[PDB]
Design an enzyme around this catalytic site. Structure first.
Site, PDB file in Angstrom:
ATOM      1  N   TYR A   1       0.826  -1.178   0.000  1.00 32.98           N
ATOM      2  CA  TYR A   1       0.000   0.000   0.000  1.00 32.98           C
ATOM      3  C   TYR A   1       0.856   1.220   0.000  1.00 32.98           C
ATOM      4  O   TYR A   1       1.683   1.376   0.879  1.00 32.98           O
ATOM      5  CB  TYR A   1      -0.855   0.032   1.238  1.00 32.98           C
TER       6      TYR A   1
ATOM      7  N   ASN B   1       1.752   2.043 -16.031  1.00 31.60           N
ATOM      8  CA  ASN B   1       3.163   1.606 -15.828  1.00 31.60           C
ATOM      9  C   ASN B   1       3.328   0.327 -14.955  1.00 31.60           C
ATOM     10  O   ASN B   1       4.410  -0.192 -14.843  1.00 31.60           O
ATOM     11  CB  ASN B   1       3.945   2.736 -15.232  1.00 31.60           C
ATOM     12  N   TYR B   2       2.253  -0.180 -14.382  1.00 39.57           N
ATOM     13  CA  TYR B   2       2.211  -1.543 -13.809  1.00 39.57           C
ATOM     14  C   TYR B   2       1.246  -2.433 -14.636  1.00 39.57           C
ATOM     15  O   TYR B   2       0.267  -2.950 -14.115  1.00 39.57           O
ATOM     16  CB  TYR B   2       1.696  -1.466 -12.391  1.00 39.57           C
TER      17      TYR B   2
HETATM   18  C1  LIG Z   1      11.075  -2.260 -12.882  1.00 41.84           C
HETATM   19  C2  LIG Z   1      10.563  -1.190 -11.984  1.00 41.84           C
HETATM   20  C3  LIG Z   1       9.526  -0.394 -12.434  1.00 41.84           C
HETATM   21  C4  LIG Z   1       8.992   0.595 -11.625  1.00 41.84           C
HETATM   22  C5  LIG Z   1       9.561   0.796 -10.270  1.00 41.84           C
HETATM   23  N1  LIG Z   1       9.067   1.760  -9.457  1.00 41.84           N
HETATM   24  C6  LIG Z   1       8.225   2.706  -9.967  1.00 41.84           C
HETATM   25  C7  LIG Z   1       7.823   3.896  -9.227  1.00 41.84           C
HETATM   26  O1  LIG Z   1       8.288   4.083  -8.088  1.00 41.84           O
HETATM   27  N2  LIG Z   1       6.977   4.772  -9.779  1.00 41.84           N
HETATM   28  C8  LIG Z   1       6.491   4.595 -11.019  1.00 41.84           C
HETATM   29  O2  LIG Z   1       5.718   5.447 -11.490  1.00 41.84           O
HETATM   30  N3  LIG Z   1       6.818   3.504 -11.768  1.00 41.84           N
HETATM   31  C9  LIG Z   1       7.647   2.563 -11.301  1.00 41.84           C
HETATM   32  N4  LIG Z   1       7.974   1.456 -12.057  1.00 41.84           N
HETATM   33  C10 LIG Z   1       7.214   1.219 -13.267  1.00 41.84           C
HETATM   34  C11 LIG Z   1       7.904   1.967 -14.405  1.00 41.84           C
HETATM   35  O3  LIG Z   1       7.537   3.351 -14.351  1.00 41.84           O
HETATM   36  C12 LIG Z   1       7.551   1.335 -15.740  1.00 41.84           C
HETATM   37  O4  LIG Z   1       8.078   0.007 -15.724  1.00 41.84           O
HETATM   38  C13 LIG Z   1       8.103   2.105 -16.949  1.00 41.84           C
HETATM   39  O5  LIG Z   1       7.198   1.861 -18.046  1.00 41.84           O
HETATM   40  C14 LIG Z   1       9.531   1.666 -17.275  1.00 41.84           C
HETATM   41  O6  LIG Z   1      10.104   2.557 -18.244  1.00 41.84           O
HETATM   42  P1  LIG Z   1      11.363   1.964 -19.014  1.00 41.84           P
HETATM   43  O7  LIG Z   1      12.313   1.456 -18.014  1.00 41.84           O
HETATM   44  O8  LIG Z   1      11.818   2.919 -20.080  1.00 41.84           O
HETATM   45  O9  LIG Z   1      10.964   0.528 -19.615  1.00 41.84           O
HETATM   46  P2  LIG Z   1      10.894  -0.098 -21.083  1.00 41.84           P
HETATM   47  O10 LIG Z   1      10.558  -1.538 -20.789  1.00 41.84           O
HETATM   48  O11 LIG Z   1      12.120   0.073 -21.927  1.00 41.84           O
HETATM   49  O12 LIG Z   1       9.631   0.575 -21.749  1.00 41.84           O
HETATM   50  C15 LIG Z   1       8.304   0.606 -21.199  1.00 41.84           C
HETATM   51  C16 LIG Z   1       7.321   0.922 -22.322  1.00 41.84           C
HETATM   52  O13 LIG Z   1       7.609   2.274 -22.803  1.00 41.84           O
HETATM   53  C17 LIG Z   1       8.051   2.204 -24.136  1.00 41.84           C
HETATM   54  N5  LIG Z   1       9.212   3.082 -24.240  1.00 41.84           N
HETATM   55  C18 LIG Z   1      10.384   3.033 -23.584  1.00 41.84           C
HETATM   56  N6  LIG Z   1      11.178   4.001 -24.080  1.00 41.84           N
HETATM   57  C19 LIG Z   1      10.474   4.708 -24.977  1.00 41.84           C
HETATM   58  C20 LIG Z   1      10.692   5.905 -25.808  1.00 41.84           C
HETATM   59  N7  LIG Z   1      11.856   6.508 -25.726  1.00 41.84           N
HETATM   60  N8  LIG Z   1       9.730   6.341 -26.624  1.00 41.84           N
HETATM   61  C21 LIG Z   1       8.572   5.671 -26.684  1.00 41.84           C
HETATM   62  N9  LIG Z   1       8.313   4.584 -25.943  1.00 41.84           N
HETATM   63  C22 LIG Z   1       9.209   4.103 -25.097  1.00 41.84           C
HETATM   64  C23 LIG Z   1       8.440   0.778 -24.414  1.00 41.84           C
HETATM   65  O14 LIG Z   1       8.301   0.472 -25.774  1.00 41.84           O
HETATM   66  C24 LIG Z   1       7.501  -0.016 -23.507  1.00 41.84           C
HETATM   67  O15 LIG Z   1       6.275  -0.189 -24.174  1.00 41.84           O
HETATM   68  C25 LIG Z   1      10.588  -0.041  -9.829  1.00 41.84           C
HETATM   69  C26 LIG Z   1      11.146  -1.052 -10.619  1.00 41.84           C
HETATM   70  C27 LIG Z   1      12.287  -1.969 -10.091  1.00 41.84           C
HETATM   71  O1  LIG Z   2       7.135   0.799  -8.011  1.00 39.06           O
HETATM   72  C1  LIG Z   2       7.026  -0.377  -7.178  1.00 39.06           C
HETATM   73  C2  LIG Z   2       7.738  -1.452  -7.753  1.00 39.06           C
HETATM   74  C3  LIG Z   2       8.685  -2.199  -7.032  1.00 39.06           C
HETATM   75  C4  LIG Z   2       9.352  -3.253  -7.690  1.00 39.06           C
HETATM   76  O2  LIG Z   2      10.261  -4.025  -7.081  1.00 39.06           O
HETATM   77  C5  LIG Z   2       9.102  -3.564  -9.006  1.00 39.06           C
HETATM   78  C6  LIG Z   2       8.156  -2.794  -9.676  1.00 39.06           C
HETATM   79  C7  LIG Z   2       7.838  -3.046 -11.004  1.00 39.06           C
HETATM   80  C8  LIG Z   2       8.557  -3.971 -11.771  1.00 39.06           C
HETATM   81  C9  LIG Z   2       8.226  -4.192 -13.110  1.00 39.06           C
HETATM   82  C10 LIG Z   2       7.196  -3.482 -13.714  1.00 39.06           C
HETATM   83  C11 LIG Z   2       6.482  -2.550 -12.947  1.00 39.06           C
HETATM   84  N1  LIG Z   2       6.818  -2.339 -11.563  1.00 39.06           N
HETATM   85  N2  LIG Z   2       7.501  -1.776  -9.044  1.00 39.06           N
END
Ligand SMILES: *Cc1cc2c(nc3c(=O)[nH]c(=O)nc-3n2C[C@H](O)[C@H](O)[C@H](O)COP(=O)(O)OP(=O)(O)OC[C@H]2O[C@@H](n3cnc4c(N)ncnc43)[C@H](O)[C@@H]2O)c(*)c1C
Ligand SMILES: OCc1cc(O)cc(-c2ccccn2)n1
Ligand SMILES: *Cc1cc2c(nc3c(=O)[nH]c(=O)nc-3n2C[C@H](O)[C@H](O)[C@H](O)COP(=O)(O)OP(=O)(O)OC[C@H]2O[C@@H](n3cnc4c(N)ncnc43)[C@H](O)[C@@H]2O)c(*)c1C
Ligand SMILES: OCc1cc(O)cc(-c2ccccn2)n1
Lengths: 498, 498
Positions: free
Chosen positions: A375, A446-447
């Site tokens: 949460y 983004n999840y």
């Molecule tokens: C793994 C992970 C994800 C987390 C974590 N904690 C977060 C937090 O504290 N707050 C948040 O708001 N989000 C958190 N997230 C989730 C991430 O925000 C998402 O996982 C993002 O989508 C990741 O972005 P990115 O690392 O760039 O991942 P990609 O897999 O390369 O792409 C995701 C998605 O977006 C498209 N894409 C990437 N780059 C581009 C550009 N330049 N232009 C267009 N589209 C782009 C990709 O094609 C894909 O579809 C904590 C952790 C550990």
């Molecule tokens: O933002 C919380 C969080 C913690 C974490 O260990 C992993 C992720 C996560 C990992 C992959 C895709 C979306 N979120 N998010």
């Protein structure tokens, strides 16, 4: 500039590039393209477009699903070598190339200029996917969402006759590309074109010194780290503890609350992990900060028999932020198979929903110390924004996050079963998903979770796109049709043109 | 470029900048200077020189001791904004600015060029301290040490009149400043001048393509991770297991071994931790690689009654390296108080020594899951170069490493006492320290330990400088007197002029 790198299956690098944060999804394109400049992104996209090839982009590799790494993707453009972060004086804004990771961004902005912006706490997360989808984290209650600081974005786009251009879209009122700007304020990655860089700036910044272009975070924080031993928990204690957390957060989620500066996250791990954990932080400079944290912890423990272990200390902001951050290396980061889910709340879970959670989190028939629901406090400055102004849904007071992480593919079926079952049981009164209503407000793009589009798990009648975008979806479709009219950029949950 | 940043104590960045990897040592300078170019590092050093201020340099903040943060330091030059890594076409070598971190160096080199250099496993370690001290890691048995690739180094130096200048010192035989280059091949940080940048290149590299200027690691590795429970671990078990580890490592520590690709690290945690742990790795393209890891594991456990929980898997090199690396964020990295020690071996610890380690590792009146000693495989290609040719003492076939980390300043005495007593009692035959002899080779400058200069813990009569540098110290002293005649750069274990 050095020429763009092409990595084919015979190159030793290919197998590494095929792998990102989720080991369930291994990419197999014809090649990876690693560009160094916007003009090389142009060239990469225009090649793929000419020959009808399926193209996706990767920035940080953190996608929860197979959006980038689908086996039918032909070309993957990896932006990890475009990671510059710098102040742009012509625009009065910090420029962030899309392959910069959040952890690096925070360090550069803060040490060099003393500022920050409110993104997430995971370190290897790329700006590309994070910002466009409506990035949040521990400072959001005070500072809002990342996208509230998005001054401009530069995007590589493809028109209906296959002509590729680079456009800069800004938030200025008269900007003819304003719509493409708005889409990047919550529309999500992989939809409109290749984001090459973002520009960040407070909408009410004064003058043009970088030190004023984004907010100064508070200088230091009282931090509490708390755990409750699972060996000492009962159902009733679990229910009461989470209820107290929720009730306190729902009373204290607006900018009027004198506790608005207090951010807390409650991680409810499955019993195999040994504990429930929480971290809380409050800026030192908030009146009575340290007493506010004490009242909060004492409220948490009312009517609960298990006594927590507690450590309290004081740290500077950037250190507070790195303490809580999730590592990009080590056994928790590398070679890990994952499934995540999401549900946002504007109201409390019921005692029955919490007893069902308890039943799944204590199951002694399952062993996964990295299985959890969480949460996450939210609200505050996030919800003072006119919701028309950006594409991100607004109005949740609290986010919840579900995750299982494991290493053995033999075990896929039981980890997927465990996360699906707990999330469906929790949401059994609403067809197994958080249908926007009095208690749920949806989920976070983004999840992403493709079970939301699966008739066996989503029996609500409510489509995935409503769950993630609510009322912003149809405007997003229209902007999609204008800017990516051929649907070059797509994936299972991409905006459908209409 | 941007003008250099000055952070005084009234700036909110000061408290953060004052805190590095070890929270025991909090810097209190007059100011931090963050320079963006070599010219600005000259300006910074010239200011401190003019007014006789005590100046130190920080790159990654990983010092084990207070060499940077000691309270008598007035000015700290923090190089974290100089972190460029790229190929320098003019000199045929990869340019690494001193503030780049090893994590980032490996990602850039490998992804952009498919190459690497055998540095350390910890993510946030800075090039500045790491390379000059003679960095090593998991690939050193196959590839040697970082300094074996050191083609050149740029250093800001101060002459006897206090004129500050920049010199580039190369490995070439006709280089009139070769001596300065050599001092940087293991003389350690904080002695000769401010390193602004290193140039890396194989001595034997063909042509001038970046892809050929450093080695390609092996593409894939078999990896094994192992743990034995402390639950019914007995002295007898403990002593058989390490002996088995050591016998094996000592038979297979040379370039002639067909097992030399097999790299393994044994972590002997205090009982507090619950388990003993080990990670091993071997490249995939080593003939019968999968079986050799089987043999190695078999011999390990022979005569040992605890059965190890074991997992084996195959990964790309860069993933393998990030799996075993230590995170630069999270509870393990941030706000941690530490003490480290080290001792290198040329032959086995005796049964008595191991009994003594067991006793201290079992001591039930002590609690610290982070307390351990480790046996790190070493040797191989490291030991095929002339000990003369660099400043790093060579001879060790195996490295050992001691650490306690905690967060409560009130518990400092208990943790210091433990690490000090275990180290002493293992070296009780040799006055409490690893005196260079038939079985010990010394200790490593990059794991410094001021207790080797403390008459109460070092009763051997062998001075610290011999333990760290053996035969190379007098030569280092002579280079020191020539290049830092005013002893501007100093600290507790700095080369003393003469
Ligand atoms: C793994 C992970 C994800 C987390 C974590 N904690 C977060 C937090 O504290 N707050 C948040 O708001 N989000 C958190 N997230 C989730 C991430 O925000 C998402 O996982 C993002 O989508 C990741 O972005 P990115 O690392 O760039 O991942 P990609 O897999 O390369 O792409 C995701 C998605 O977006 C498209 N894409 C990437 N780059 C581009 C550009 N330049 N232009 C267009 N589209 C782009 C990709 O094609 C894909 O579809 C904590 C952790 C550990
Ligand atoms: O933002 C919380 C969080 C913690 C974490 O260990 C992993 C992720 C996560 C990992 C992959 C895709 C979306 N979120 N998010
Ligand atoms: C914390 C840590 C250290 C590690 C780790 N793993 C290692 C490994 O796997 N192999 C190794 O060979 N070494 C490992 N170490 C030890 C580190 O190598 C040392 O701790 C390094 O000295 C750290 O370097 P750096 O991070 O730059 O530390 P600083 O504290 O900034 O400075 C150290 C020392 O060097 C002087 N100095 C720094 N920078 C410069 C420049 N540019 N010019 C001159 N002198 C410089 C400082 O003044 C100080 O004297 C794993 C982990 C987790
Ligand atoms: O090099 C092994 C290692 C592991 C670790 O967790 C910490 C350190 C360390 C920490 C500080 C100074 C020197 N080494 N070293």
């Amino acid at each position: 500039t050095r020429a763009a790198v092409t990595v084919k299956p015979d190159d030793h690098r290919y197998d590494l590039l095929a792998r990102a944060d989720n080991y369930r999804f291994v990419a197999q394109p014809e090649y990876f393209r690693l560009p160094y400049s916007t003009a090389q992104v142009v060239e990469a996209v225009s090649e793929a477009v000419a020959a009808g090839k399926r193209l996706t982009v990767r920035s940080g590799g953190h996608c929860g699903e197979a959006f980038v790494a689908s086996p039918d993707v032909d070309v993957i453009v990896d932006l990890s070598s475009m990671s510059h972060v710098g102040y742009d004086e012509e625009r009065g804004a910090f420029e962030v190339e899309a392959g910069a990771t959040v952890g690096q961004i925070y360090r550069v902005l803060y040490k060099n200029y003393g500022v920050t912006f409110p993104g997430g706490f995971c370190m290897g997360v790329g700006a590309g996917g994070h910002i466009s989808g409506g990035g949040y984290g521990p400072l959001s209650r005070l500072l809002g969402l990342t996208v509230d600081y998005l001054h401009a974005v530069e995007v590589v786009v493809v028109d209906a006759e296959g002509v590729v251009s680079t456009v800069v879209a800004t938030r200025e009122e008269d900007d003819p590309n304003r719509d493409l700007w708005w889409a990047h304020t919550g529309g999500g990655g992989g939809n409109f074109g290749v984001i090459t860089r973002y520009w960040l700036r407070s909408p009410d910044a004064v003058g043009d010194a970088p030190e004023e272009a984004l907010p100064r975070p508070p200088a230091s924080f009282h931090v509490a780290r708390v755990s409750w031993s699972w060996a000492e928990l009962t159902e009733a204690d679990y229910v009461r503890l989470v209820s107290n957390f929720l009730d306190w957060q729902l009373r204290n989620c607006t900018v009027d609350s004198p506790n608005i500066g207090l951010y807390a996250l409650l991680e409810c791990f499955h019993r195999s992990a040994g504990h429930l954990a929480m971290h809380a932080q409050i800026p030192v400079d908030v009146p009575d900060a340290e007493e506010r944290m004490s009242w909060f912890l004492a409220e948490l423990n009312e009517g609960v028999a298990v006594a927590p272990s507690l450590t309290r200390r004081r740290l500077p902001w950037l250190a507070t932020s790195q303490l809580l951050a999730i590592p990009d290396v080590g056994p928790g980061a590398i070679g890990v198979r994952r499934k995540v889910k999401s549900a946002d709340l504007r109201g409390p879970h019921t005692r029955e929903q919490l007893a069902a959670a308890y039943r799944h989190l204590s199951r002694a028939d399952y062993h996964c110390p990295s299985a959890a629901m969480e949460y996450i406090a939210y609200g505050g400055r996030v919800n003072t924004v006119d919701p028309a102004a950006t594409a991100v849904p607004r109005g949740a007071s609290l986010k919840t996050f579900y995750m299982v992480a494991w290493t053995d593919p033999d075990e896929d079926e039981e980890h997927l079963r465990w996360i699906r079952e707990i999330y469906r049981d929790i949401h059994s009164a609403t067809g197994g998903v958080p249908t926007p209503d009095e208690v749920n407000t949806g989920a976070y793009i983004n999840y992403p979770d493709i079970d939301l589009a699966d008739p066996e798990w989503n029996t609500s009648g409510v489509p995935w796109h409503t769950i993630y975008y609510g009322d912003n979806y149809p405007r997003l479709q229209e902007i999609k049709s204008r800017w990516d009219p051929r649907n070059v950029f797509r994936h299972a949950f991409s905006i459908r043109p209409r």
